Amino acid sequence: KLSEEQQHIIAILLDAHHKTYDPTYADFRDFRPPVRMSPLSMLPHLADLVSYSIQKVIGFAKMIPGFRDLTSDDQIVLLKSSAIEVIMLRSNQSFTMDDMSWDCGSQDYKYDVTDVSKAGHTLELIEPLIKFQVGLKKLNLHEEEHVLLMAICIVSPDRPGVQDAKLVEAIQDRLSNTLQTYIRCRHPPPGSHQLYAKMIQKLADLRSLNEEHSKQYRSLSFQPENSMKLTPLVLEVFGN
Amino acid sequence: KNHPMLMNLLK
Ligand SMILES: C=C1[C@H](O)CC(=C/C=C2\CCC[C@]3(C)[C@@H]([C@H](C)/C=C/[C@@H](O)[C@]45C[C@H]6C[C@H](C[C@H](C6)C4)C5)CC[C@@H]23)C[C@H]1O
Question: Which positions does the motif LXXLL motif 2 occupy (chain B)?
Answer without folding.
Answer: 6-10
